[PDB]
Amino acid sequence: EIISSVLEEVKRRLETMSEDEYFESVKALLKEAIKELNEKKVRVMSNEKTLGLIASRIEEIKSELGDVSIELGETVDTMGGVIVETEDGRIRIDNTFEARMERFEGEIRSTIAKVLFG
Amino acid sequence: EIISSVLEEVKRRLETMSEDEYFESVKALLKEAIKELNEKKVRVMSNEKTLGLIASRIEEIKSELGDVSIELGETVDTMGGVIVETEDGRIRIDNTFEARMERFEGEIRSTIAKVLFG
């Protein structure tokens, strides 16, 4: 439940976020996933808006990310972020805000521990 | 609002917390506030349950905390933690879970930033 509540704060911040700021998130999460897969050709999935951004700014993405090839995949219901997989679909990395918040849960718990026990 | 939602997680954890674990929180927050005030005689305020614990385990508190004198003050509506002030009331330190969560907000924001931008 704490994961859900923190994601509501994320969704509040996304409510006024400019496209340029959101794109910085897109590039960072894309790059991280692509580095991990260590492949030049990948398929990306996210919500409609995000895939539209990636398509619109592919030049900017290739400049900052190096020599990688991206193919849009199916749209998925997500608040943001990206799911990146090898072209053959064998390996998939989930970098959606929902999955990332779950993985960062430990950090929220460290904060709570500090509040309680210092 | 994010502060309120994280405090709901704190309140969930307090729902099953044993007296001994809660007392570790009490001692830690009391000690921190007393060190800051750097005074031997202080007055403490918290909810009824907490003041009752402090009263019941004053020996344990004095052993782990050194030579300090504590006087119970008025009960305040709080989830837990303590408010400690000099006997003359001139200086007061707010170490209630509510105040501490507010002060740790920045930590929750660092986590959110990581989720969004890595």
Contact B6 A112 (CB under 8 A): yes
Burial label, A74 (beta-carbon count in 10 A; 0-12, 13-18, 19+): exposed
Within 10 angstroms of residue B7's Cβ, the number of other Cβ atoms is: 18
Contact B28 A111 (CB under 8 A): no
- Cα–Cα distance between B79 and B22 in angstroms, integer? 12
Experimental method: X-ray
Contact B118 A2 (CB under 8 A): no
Q: What is the resolution of this structure in A?
A: 2.0
Q: What is the DSSP letter of A81?
A: E
* Nearest in space to B45 (alpha carbons), one of B99, B104, B101, B4: B99
State how far the alpha carbon of B32 is from the alpha carbons of B15, B35, B37, B81, in Å: 24, 5, 9, 11
CB B70 within 8 A of CB B61: yes
Name chain B contacts of A28, Cβ cutoff 8 Å.
Answer: 117-118
Contact A9 B10 (CB under 8 A): no
Contact A5 B10 (CB under 8 A): no
Name chain A contacts of B101, Cβ cutoff 8 Å.
Answer: 115
CB A7 within 8 A of CB A103: no
Cα A59 from chain centre = 19
Q: Are strands A81-86 and A41-45 parallel, antiparallel or unpaired?
A: antiparallel
CB B102 within 8 A of CB B3: yes
Cα dihedral B32, B38, B41, B42 sign: negative
Name chain A contacts of B112, Cβ cutoff 8 Å.
Answer: 6, 9-10, 13
Cα A83 from chain centre = 7
DSSP character string of B79-111: SSEEEEEETTSS-EEEEEHHHHHHHTHHHHHHH
- Cα–Cα distance between A111 and A17 in angstroms, integer? 26
Contact B101 A107 (CB under 8 A): no
Nearest CA-CA distance, residue A2 and chain B, Å: 6
Name chain B contacts of A106, Cβ cutoff 8 Å.
Answer: none
CB B82 within 8 A of CB B49: no
The domains located in chain A, with CATH, are 1-118 (3.30.2320.30)
- What chain A residue is nearest to B27 in terms of C-alpha separation? A117
- Which H/E stretch holds residue A83? strand A81-86
- Which H/E stretch holds residue B116? helix B105-117
Extract the tokens encoding B108.
């929750």
